[PDB]
Design a protein around this ligand. Structure first.
Ligand code: MG
Ligand code: MG
Ligand code: MG
Lengths: 243, 117, 76, 154, 43, 95
RNA sequence: GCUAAACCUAGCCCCAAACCCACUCCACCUUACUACCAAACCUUAGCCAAACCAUUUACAUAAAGUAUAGGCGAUA
RNA sequence: GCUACCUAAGAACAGAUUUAUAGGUAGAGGCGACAAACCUA
RNA sequence: CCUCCGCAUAAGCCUGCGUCAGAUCACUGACAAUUAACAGCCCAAUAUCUACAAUCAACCAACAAGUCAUUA
RNA sequence: ACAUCACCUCUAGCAUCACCAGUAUUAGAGGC
RNA sequence: UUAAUUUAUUAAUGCAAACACCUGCAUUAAAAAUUUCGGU
């Protein structure tokens, strides 16, 4: 026989089920939206409808999102939105030949940045395209403030963004101790990506890490029923005091 | 080439027999010379009281009446136990009522349990 | 050539992730659960001690803190 | 002994009752085994099970009192401390912790307990769901069709 | 011919549960037997 | 970087549909290599008495090697962002 | 005449609906069914059909089986 | 786990010997005094 | 009249010609067994010595170059 | 018929998982 | 295999890219991979 709800949302089904369904609504939104980033190799077409080349017919055409072949190690640093491409190719790029499976891997470089928001130097692998992205953002802190985490497409940079957001919404003196003037200047500079203190709770963590924050959050030593019955008897005594 | 039996004592070679055992609880420790020393500390200790003069016989006579199955409800027992102390104290800080912060110092703690059966 | 290969020696430590290197935020490691596992961040425990004093595993005190260790070693 | 009737006796009296029950039950076991050795009938066949039942009721009272103690003093639900988790067979279960000396940051055996499941448990888990559903629809069809034949009998 | 000269130590070695659970393909083997619903889930 | 494209032209998808592609659709044809493309200089405003490239307060487009590796890592120059542009204009007008 | 035959009814069948499974105490990843010391993701492949073989090839209703593509040869 | 080859660590009487036990080499393979032989009818 | 076997441990199997009754060259059900000194099951830290084979081990005679020790 | 001592030829100037814990009187591969 | 063809992969170069490492493009091999050894 047949299963009632569809398995195409079975995972999504569990997203509304139980203890994990007690997660923050902001976390639900951040795991719920699926906005797409600009591509690494899928150059965008012009507009909605355009004339056919060999037919001269006004046809609406879209562009294919090429899947980003992300090796695991590139998550350990702040790479760009680029990577490798696991596909195939023809010998002379000619479809009338016997094609073979092929790969397009990136050329990374181990560089370093020194964030004032972090107020520390982090050295990791990045891309020259990622270098250009940071330069166009003019600073790593502003870049962390700028792109979406879905646009980030990297775990380490997402973690760095989470830390930067926590520091910005915290405004603790430990960010710039014995230099509150520089702290205030940076806070004015970093006033753009201000977030609520509650927003730092599930900031950029894994879905498994979201379950982790839940179990670290929803758990507590259970209330004593000696204490509970004592409180109930106190309530009964207060009520009978009016009797 | 036989598998459907249980894994009790008799399976294979000498030491292969040696490790596992039936459902005992261990009592001692293994030290030099392959000599086991079993402390009186870790042993079972079954100290039953004296049975003389208890008038409750092992079976109960059928001439007695029947009652209602009153399960030991936690709120009911708690009320029955704490009613007089709270009634006097409110007419008069739960340490006077005996609320236990932790059972770390008691012989028979509950969470975890250290009593037996 | 130094004697002994490194193969049967102790395993080299894998790289600790930059999640532990976060300057502000303590990561949500494997502490709350009980699984040295892949689905979370690795718990990092401090140096704990066995408070109990028992014959079975009481290791010796260090041989610089020993009550009798003279600079003039005895030829025995 | 009736359970609530037995519930009115003291704890020392409870110990006395348990010991008397132990003696009578031992008498029962020896008598039955001897009856097998003599290959004859039993003199009081209901007596053994009755003593067993009374001992079980006394145990139920003892468990009720211990449960009232656990509920009052701390209130934890399962008397042994433990948890719900997932095992290497991929299913959801409740594992029991065990009282052991060394800690979970150094426990040489407990760390060997691979209690992690990567994505390679998907098709089997859904298949387990499938078998459960198959038995479910089977029993439902059997019951309702048996009901239809039953109504046909009237 | 007397080829099957089995031995219990090597039996629980090459057919046991720890070794059959050491690599995750064997875990899949355990699961395959489980959805097959046998009794001798290992050896 | 590098940009490629689907050589066998992909079937269209529509508005509320995903590109349920072909097993042939994985084979791309390489369009361009941005790593092999002509580089552009980086425009930034200096803050310190630099060498023959410029002086303090001088905004110029230098090579990325001297900018990132030498100027920006040493902090001798900062980015010529529009928020930094106001600060540079104020520094120039407060002379 | 014997062996034999024959007998309903166990429960399976598909659907309809509906989201389900996991704690008597215990033990259970070491030799699973024993109370105890210092580590994961890396493009499914291939035939078949071309009457042989090679590029190509699948693992609600309506436009429409038209526009796209084919050793422009089989079709999708 | 038979057998082929190897390791660990034992045994018998005269080596290119055999063998009690564990362990290792997985088919697109290993092994091979190469028999185009073996690796569970 | 046979016995180049036999008796033990080892491994390996798993109660498998023990007892009281059935009837299936003339197996089934119930009941009872094997009480360890042998063998496993082990060994509180940190450092530090551990060249002088064995062959009846004293000679001869070697090569395939040695199968076993603590101490602080 | 294959292995092989003997002999001949060829490659390799050297180290931490085999060769090898070795250094061309060495290591590997062919012929009779 | 010195039948044919490549070269997915290495190894070299050389050229790019970055200031010894990585990626891309050519050539060369080693090794592979795809396809042929007709009829009366
Ligand atoms: Mg054909
Ligand atoms: Mg073997
Ligand atoms: Mg003894």
């Amino acid at each position: 026989p047949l299963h009632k709800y569809p398995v195409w949302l079975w995972k999504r089904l569990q997203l509304r089920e139980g203890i994990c369904s007690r997660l923050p609504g902001h976390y639900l939104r951040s795991l719920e939206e699926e906005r797409t980033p600009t591509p690494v190799h899928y150059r965008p077409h012009g507009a909605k409808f355009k004339i056919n080349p060999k037919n001269g017919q006004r046809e609406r055409v879209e562009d294919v999102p090429i899947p980003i072949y992300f090796p695991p190690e590139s998550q350990r640093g702040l790479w760009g939105g680029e990577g490798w491409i696991l596909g195939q190719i023809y010998a002379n790029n000619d479809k009338l030949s016997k094609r073979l499976k092929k790969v397009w891997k990136p050329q990374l470089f181990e560089r370093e940045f020194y964030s004032e928001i972090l107020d520390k130097k982090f050295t990791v692998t990045v891309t020259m395209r990622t270098l250009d992205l940071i330069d166009e953002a003019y600073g790593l802190d502003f870049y962390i403030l700028k792109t979406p985490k879905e646009d980030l497409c990297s775990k380490f940079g997402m973690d760095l963004k989470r830390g930067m957001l926590l520091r910005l919404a915290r405004q603790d003196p430990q960010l710039h101790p014995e230099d509150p003037e520089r702290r205030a200047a940076i806070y004015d500079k970093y006033k753009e990506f201000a977030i609520p203190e509650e927003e730092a709770e599930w900031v950029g963590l894994t879905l498994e890490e979201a379950i982790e924050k839940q179990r670290l959050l929803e758990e507590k030593d259970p209330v004593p029923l000696f204490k509970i019955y004592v409180a109930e008897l106190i309530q009964q005594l207060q009520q009978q005091a009016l009797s | 080439a036989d598998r459907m039996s249980k894994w009790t004592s008799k399976r294979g070679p000498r030491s292969f027999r040696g490790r596992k055992g039936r459902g005992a609880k261990g009592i001692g420790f293994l030290t030099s010379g392959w000599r086991f020393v079993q402390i009186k500390e870790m042993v079972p200790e079954f100290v039953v009281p004296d049975l003389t003069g208890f008038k409750l016989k092992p079976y109960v006579s059928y001439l007695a009446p029947e009652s209602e199955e009153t399960p030991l409800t936690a709120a009911q027992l708690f009320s029955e136990a704490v009613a007089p102390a709270i009634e006097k104290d409110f007419k008069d800080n739960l340490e006077k009522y005996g609320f236990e912060p932790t059972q770390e110092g008691k012989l028979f703690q509950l969470y975890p349990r250290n009593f037996l059966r | 050539y130094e004697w002994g290969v490194r193969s049967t020696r102790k395993s080299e430590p894998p790289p600790l992730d930059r999640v532990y290197e976060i300057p502000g935020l303590e990561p949500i490691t494997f502490a709350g659960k009980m699984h040295f596992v892949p689905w979370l961040a690795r718990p990092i425990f401090p140096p704990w001690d066995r408070g109990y004093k028992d014959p079975r595993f009481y290791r010796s005190p260090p041989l610089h803190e020993h009550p009798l260790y003279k600079d003039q070693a005895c030829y025995i | 002994w009736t359970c609530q009737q037995l519930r009115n006796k003291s704890n020392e009296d409870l110990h006395k009752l348990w010991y008397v029950l132990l003696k009578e039950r031992n008498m029962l076991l020896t008598l039955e085994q001897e009856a097998k050795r003599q290959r004859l009938p039993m003199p009081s066949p209901e007596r053994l099970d009755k003593v067993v039942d009374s001992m079980d009721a006394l145990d139920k009272v003892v468990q009720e009192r211990e449960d009232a103690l656990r509920l009052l003093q701390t209130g934890q639900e399962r008397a042994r401390p433990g948890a719900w988790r997932r095992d290497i067979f991929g299913r959801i279960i409740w594992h029991k912790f065990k009282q052991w000396v060394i800690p979970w940051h150094l426990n040489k055996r407990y760390n060997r307990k691979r209690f992690f499941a990567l994505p390679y448990v998907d098709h089997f888990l859904r298949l387990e769901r499938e078998k459960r559903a198959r038995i479910k629809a089977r029993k439902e069809n059997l019951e309702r069709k048996k009901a239809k034949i039953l109504l046909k009998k009237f | 011919g007397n080829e099957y000269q089995p031995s219990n130590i090597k039996r629980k070695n090459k057919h046991g549960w720890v070794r059959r659970l050491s690599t995750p393909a064997g875990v899949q083997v355990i699961l395959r037997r489980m959805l097959k619903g046998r009794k001798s889930l290992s050896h | 970087t590098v940009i490629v494209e689907r050589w066998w032209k992909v079937p269209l998808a529509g508005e509320g549909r995903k590109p349920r592609l072909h097993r042939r659709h994985r084979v791309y044809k390489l369009v361009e290599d941005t790593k092999h493309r002509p580089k552009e200089n980086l425009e930034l405003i200096l803050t310190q008495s630099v060498e023959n490239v410029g002086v303090r307060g001088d905004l110029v487009s230098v090579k990325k090697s001297l900018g990132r590796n030498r100027l920006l890592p040493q902090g001798l120059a900062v980015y010529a962002s529009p928020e930094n542009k106001k600060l540079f204009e104020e520094e120039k007008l407060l002379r």
